[PDB]
Amino acid sequence: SRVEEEERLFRDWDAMVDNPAAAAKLLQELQPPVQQVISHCRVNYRQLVAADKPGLVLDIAALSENDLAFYCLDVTRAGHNGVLAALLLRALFNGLLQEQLAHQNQRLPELGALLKQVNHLLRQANLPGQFPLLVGYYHRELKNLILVSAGLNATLNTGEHQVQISNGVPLGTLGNAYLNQLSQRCDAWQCQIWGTGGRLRLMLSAE
Amino acid sequence: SRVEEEERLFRDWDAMVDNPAAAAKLLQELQPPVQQVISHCRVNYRQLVAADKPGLVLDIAALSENDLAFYCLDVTRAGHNGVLAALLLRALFNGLLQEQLAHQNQRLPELGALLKQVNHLLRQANLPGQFPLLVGYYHRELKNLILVSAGLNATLNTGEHQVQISNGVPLGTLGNAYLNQLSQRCDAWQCQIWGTGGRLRLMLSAE
């Protein structure tokens, strides 16, 4: 179905660019389930206010049997272009990170470099605006969590460790390098992400 | 004088182990100046309450012409052993990090590995207790700041980015790996560190 969702995102893209209602409706239908198992990890997601319109959106998916990645985007800053950016990320984000790891001999993710690539992708898709974005990577065996924020606020709790991040440089500008990085080793974590568009909660545990 | 201070720390160590008043008096005299230039960086330090007794102590020094490192230790958790640990770190911390970089082909610091080494050093110096410690690295040309906390709270402000960290695992236990890491690229930053023992402020700018 994720494979099938990728085909509808590719085939219907032009129709979604010209129909904001349809694009927003599909974006709401593509939200993660409340709980799932990804790469031997329990993953729980919920918006902290029950709403019908997309504000802060999230996607999370496996990169291999043993690691996963996620992105979180505030679509309200760029309006329709923000919704389209979320749909574009849903189609290509995981594949872009998988390609970068395929060129890294030890599969050590460079989320800052990925954000630079996403910035270029948004330009080449003709999606101007500002896109507050948070990207994360987790490996179930190494127990390593990596977080990079570009314009979003976030709290990370691992029990022994607590971090609050508030980055003010969203994606969408020409020459910003996004190099803040939080790396944390943990077996479980709870993360809350928020911006103007809303606030969500994402938690992870071993299966 | 820093070279000369290293010789008195080595020669008088045994006398300081047996005289807590002398050890604490020397520790207070070894605090950083209010402002200095280290590795082409302005460095400003102040305790946020004017006090005579050591609580949260800091040292910062160059690793080369272009980078520097610092540590911050709450000496009140282990009492006299905490004061001694600070004196031991003042003597050896910079040299230990310089040796680690000499074995890394690109001089990429591993502050988590350094903390593991410091934990072993405290054991071999026969200094039991708990030692809340924060270590930092900054490179003036790459503009990269790295922070790792083991039991201390800290806020980092770079203008575009703000981070609050509160780690609960101080040094002194047997088998803790210390792997939280904040990496941030910035030209200037202001950092406030605190624990039970007190609170200090450290800021950096280009010279």
Author numbering:
A (entry chain A), B (entry chain A): 102 to 308
Publication excerpt:
The structure of the RssBC was solved at 2.1 Å by multiple isomorphous replacement. The RssBC domain structure is a mixed α/β-fold with five α-helices and 11 β-strands and can be further divided into a mediator/connector domain (residues 131–163) connecting RssBN with RssBC and the actual C-terminal protein phosphatase (PP2C) domain (residues 164–337). The N-terminal part or connector domain of RssBC comprises three small α-helices (α6–α8) which are arranged with approximate angles of 90 degrees to each other. These helices are connected to the core domain by salt bridges, hydrogen bonds and hydrophobic interactions, but the conformation of the very first α6-helix is likely misaligned due to the absence of the structuring RssBN domain. The α8-helix connects the mediating α-helical elements with the C-proximal and structurally conserved phosphatase domain, which consists of 11 β-strands and two α-helices. The core structure of this domain is formed by a β–sandwich comprising two closely interacting β-sheets. The conserved residues (between EcRssB and PaRssB) are mostly located in the hydrophobic interface but also include two positively charged surface exposed patches, one of which is centered around the putative phosphatase site that corresponds to the peptides 90 and 91 from the peptide library and hence may play a role in docking to the ZBD of ClpX.
In the case of σs, a specialized adaptor protein RssB, also referred to as SprE, is not only required for direct recognition of the substrate but also required for its preparation and delivery to the AAA+ protease, ClpXP. In contrast to most RRs (which contain a DNA binding domain) RssB is linked to a protein binding domain, and as such represents one of the small groups of RRs (~1% of all RRs). Nevertheless, like most RRs, RssB is phosphorylated on a conserved Asp residue (Asp58) within the N-terminal REC domain.
